[PDB]
RNA sequence: AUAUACCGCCAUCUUCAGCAAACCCUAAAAAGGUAUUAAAGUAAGCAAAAGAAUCAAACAUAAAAACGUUAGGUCAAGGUGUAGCCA
């Protein structure tokens, strides 16, 4: 005898209730553990519903300030001819070096975006990076 | 005394002329007559093996 | 005598982290294993939005700060269950990780069911396994979906039998019936490999801790 | 359909014995003969008389041990000796069986003019081959 | 007298492939319950199959063939319910 009603309450609440009624005479071994270290949320059934009208989710689009610079670099030079290595946790791509230098110049106090874009290209050219201004 | 000697002795002491040999008297080792593995698949605690 | 049995079973519940599961993992360790990568925004379940840090260009990102809190609770619960000699069943239907999960269960000393799940396995267990079959005391769902992108039957059936479930839930999953949800990536081999390692070390520690606790208390009885 | 000596299927709750379970075509294959005499062998006489004695001996044993027979009796004739082998339930007291054996033996030995012996194997209850 | 009260023993579809019961599941069920790179069905029966018979072996032939259908046949094989006869 049990409560195979998984849409009312939770495994813990149904086990608590069954013992109060007098049907379950021995506590499950997982019961005392749940009482002492419960989950953050109670595991109760809820019917997923759809959103209607003007209800919307609340998920923040992840856009950092570097993305403004990165977008320009991809539009002007595309992706660096060197291939991304996403297995190296500290990989520095050609675009990420462009954004690191672009930031340094902006710290000096340059206020014109055009100035920061052409100066960074010159600095990387001195470094020896091959930047191709591919309109294609 | 062997399994062959057993089967021969049982045939002499309990002569049966039934055509189907599954229906004749048999004194075989329990491993044969019973299914090989009908044993419990868990112990006293109830934890499967 | 009675005090010793009470000491073995009642003392562990007086400490917040009796098995010190906190050290096994860290937010950085989870980030290396790509545990923060979720499905596209279209595949998102409504009950997962609490756990999602945001949407990075169409790909939902899973907050690894909530994952650490939830994973801590799930690992602690899995340890106390293993400490008390409960049966733990690993369940998944992802065929890429079928052999890995069966190897993990065998290493832990527990059970795995990575194959087609028969209707009634838990709600009609006596007919299938025998009159006195003992059902699992905890089910760990490394994957909570079957191969037709529907909830694994054992999620609902484990709630019907009042079995607690520790499940890995991704952005497209429904965590409502999972007792201890662990928000995280379930598709990447590096994410699944990390979770399998954590569950196996945690279970082995709790089993070892029980052996040591029994010897100390047992030795005191003559001594 | 054939209706001869076939204990037909019920709903899984009817306890049939080994003898009842098997239809006539299993005679000499899975189940033997309840009576063994030499009167149906080739070039042998008195089949009619041996068969009539068997019919009576079965009706006599049923009435003499009413409700105490677990299965059909087995009749074995050797020379002029007749031997009746019956499975009997343990319902009656032990001393009553000694009375019915002494009575049924003497009565059938003076009726057919042969030495007749009764062999009784007592069972705790009817043996069930299968539930049909 | 009644096979239109039955037992017993059969015909017919028929060497056709089905009949019946215990459990489990459903945002209720009037019903349904399959997916094998598997999605709720499971585990036992009866028939088929297998086995046995035609005295090597096969094939073939016999035998076997459930639940139902035809108030099918048989009160005259025997037994028997109900009604009827007893100078
Ligand atoms: K009839
Ligand atoms: Mg996934
Ligand atoms: Mg008729
Ligand atoms: Mg007529
Ligand atoms: Mg043959
Ligand atoms: Mg056949
Ligand atoms: Mg008619």
Task: Name the minimum distance, in Å, from the CA of A129 to any CA of chain C.
Answer: 28
3-state secondary structure of D121: strand
Q: How far apart are CA A12 and CA C179, in angstroms?
A: 9
CA end-to-end span of chain C, whole Å? 13
**Helices and strands per DSSP (H, E), number in chain B:** 2, 0
A4-30 as b/e: b if 16+ CB within 10 A: eebeebbbbebbbebeeeeebeeebbb
Task: Name the minimum distance, in Å, from the CA of C81 to any CA of chain A.
Answer: 6
Closest by alpha carbon to B25, among B48, B7, B37?
B7
Question: B13 CB near a chain D CB, below 8 Å?
Answer: no
Resolution of this structure in Å: 3.1
Could you give the angle at the alpha carbon of C167 between the alpha carbons of C56 and C170, nearest 5°?
A: 15
Q: How far is Cα of residue A49 from the mean position of the Cα atoms in its chain?
A: 25
Strand order across the C88-91 sheet: C111-113, C88-91, C138-141, C165-169, C180-183
Q: What is the DSSP code string of C21-39? A: GGGG--HHHHHHTTTTEEE
Q: Where are the alpha helices (DSSP H) in chain C?
A: 2-10, 27-32, 64-83, 98-108, 125-129, 153-160, 189-220
Chains that contact B by 3+ CB pairs under 8 Å? Answer: C, D
Residue C139 phi, psi dihedral angles, 5° rounding: -120, 125
Are A27 and A19 a contacting pair, CB within 8 Å? yes
Q: What are C63's two structure tokens?
A: 């907050």
* Other residues' Cβ atoms within 10 Å of the Cβ of residue D103: 12
Beta strand D116-123 pairing with C111-113: unpaired
Q: What are D110's two structure tokens?
A: 């003076």
Beta strand C37-40 pairing with C59-62: antiparallel
Q: How far apart are CA C64 and CA C72, in angstroms?
A: 12
Residue C81 phi, psi dihedral angles, 5° rounding: -65, -45
Residues in a beta bridge with D15: D131
Please state, in angstroms and as integers, the Cα–Cα distance from residue B14 to each residue in B6, B10, B27, D18, D34, following that order. Answer: 12, 6, 11, 19, 16
Q: Find the A3 Cα to ligand 4 centroid distance in Å.
A: 64
CA D64 – C1' E52 distance (Å)?
38
Residues within 8 A of C (CB atoms), B 1-49 only: 41-42, 45-48
Residues in a beta bridge with D87: D121
Q: How far apart are CA C109 and CA A91, in angstroms?
A: 40
Question: C188 CB near a chain A CB, below 8 Å?
Answer: no
Are A103 and A110 a contacting pair, CB within 8 Å? no
Q: What are D43's two structure tokens?
A: 């070039």
Name the residue closest to E43, CA to C1': C127
Strand order across the C52-56 sheet: C37-40, C59-62, C52-56
Q: How far apart are CA B27 and CA B33, in angstroms?
A: 9
3-state secondary structure of D114: coil
Residues in a beta bridge with C113: C91
Closest by alpha carbon to D132, among D3, D26, D22?
D22
Q: What are A101's two structure tokens?
A: 């230098």
Residues near D121 by beta carbon (within 8 Å), at least 6 away in sequence: D85, D86, D87, D88
Are A124 and A97 a contacting pair, CB within 8 Å? yes
Measured between CA atoms, the residue of chain D closest to residue B15 is: D32
3-state secondary structure of A78: coil
3-state secondary structure of B48: strand
Q: How far is Cα of residue D89 from the mean position of the Cα atoms in its chain?
A: 14
Question: C31 CB near a chain B CB, below 8 Å?
Answer: no
Query: Residue D85 burial by CB count (10 A; 0-12/13-18/19+): exposed, middle or buried?
Result: middle
Residues in a beta bridge with C166: C140, C180
Closest by alpha carbon to C82, among C2, C199, C169, C161?
C199
């Amino acid at each position: 005898a049990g409560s195979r009603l998984e849409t009312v309450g939770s495994v813990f609440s149904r086990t608590r209730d069954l013992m109060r009624a007098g049907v379950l005479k021995e506590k499950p071994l997982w019961y005392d553990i749940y009482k002492a270290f419960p989950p953050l949320r109670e595991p109760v059934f809820r019917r997923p519903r759809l959103r209607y009208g003007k209800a919307k989710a609340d998920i923040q689009d992840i856009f950092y300030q570097e993305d403004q610079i990165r977008a320009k670099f991809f539009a002007t030079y595309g992706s660096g001819q060197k291939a991304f290595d996403l297995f190296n946790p500290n990989f520095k791509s050609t675009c990420q070096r462009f954004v690191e230098k672009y930031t340094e110049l902006q710290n000096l106090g340059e206020t014109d975006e055009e100035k920061l874009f052409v100066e960074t290209g010159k600095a990387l050219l001195a470094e020896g990076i091959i930047l191709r201004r591919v309109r294609e | 005394f062997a399994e062959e000697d057993i089967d021969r002795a049982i045939a002499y002491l309990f002569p049966s002329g039934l055509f189907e040999k599954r229906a004749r008297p048999m004194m075989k080792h329990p491993e044969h007559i019973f299914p090989k593995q009908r044993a419990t698949q868990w112990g006293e605690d109830g934890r499967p093996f | 005598g009675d005090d010793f049995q009470s000491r073995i079973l009642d003392t562990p519940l007086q400490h917040s982290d009796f098995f010190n599961v906190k050290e096994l993992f860290s937010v950085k360790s989870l980030f290396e294993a790509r545990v923060h990568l979720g499905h596209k925004a279209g595949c998102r379940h409504r009950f997962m939005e609490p756990y999602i840090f945001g949407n990075r260009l169409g790909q939902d990102i899973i907050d690894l700060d909530q994952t650490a809190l939830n994973l801590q609770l799930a690992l602690n619960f899995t340890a106390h269950v293993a400490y008390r000699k409960g049966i733990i069943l690993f369940v998944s239907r992802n065929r890429q990780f079928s052999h890995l999960i069966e190897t993990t269960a065998q290493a832990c000393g527990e059970y795995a069911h990575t194959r087609y799940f028969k209707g009634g396995l838990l709600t009609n267990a006596q007919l299938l396994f025998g009159p006195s079959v003992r059902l699992p005391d905890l089910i760990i769902f490394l994957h909570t979906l079957n191969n037709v992108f529907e909830p694994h039957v054992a999620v609902r059936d484990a709630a019907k039998m009042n079995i607690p479930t520790v499940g890995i839930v991704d952005t497209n999953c429904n965590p409502c019936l999972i007792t201890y949800p662990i928000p995280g990536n379930d598709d990447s081999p590096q994410a699944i490999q990390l979770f399998c390692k954590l569950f196996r070390t945690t279970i082995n520690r709790a089993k070892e801790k029980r052996r040591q606790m029994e010897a100390l208390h047992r030795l005191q009885s003559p001594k | 359909k054939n209706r001869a000596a076939r204990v037909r299927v019920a709903k899984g709750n009817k306890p049939v014995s080994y003898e009842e379970a098997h239809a006539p075509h299993y005679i000499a294959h899975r189940k033997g003969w309840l009576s063994l005499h030499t009167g149906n062998l080739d070039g042998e006489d008195h089949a009619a008389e041996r068969t009539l004695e068997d019919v009576f001996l079965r009706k006599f044993m049923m009435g003499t041990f009413p409700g105490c027979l677990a299965d059909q009796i087995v009749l074995k004739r050797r020379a002029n000796q007749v031997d009746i082998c019956a499975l009997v339930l343990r319902q009656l007291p032990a001393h009553k069986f000694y009375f019915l054996v002494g009575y049924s033996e003497t009565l059938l030995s003076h009726f057919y003019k042969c030495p007749v012996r009764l062999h009784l194997q007592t069972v705790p209850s009817k043996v069930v081959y299968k539930y049909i």
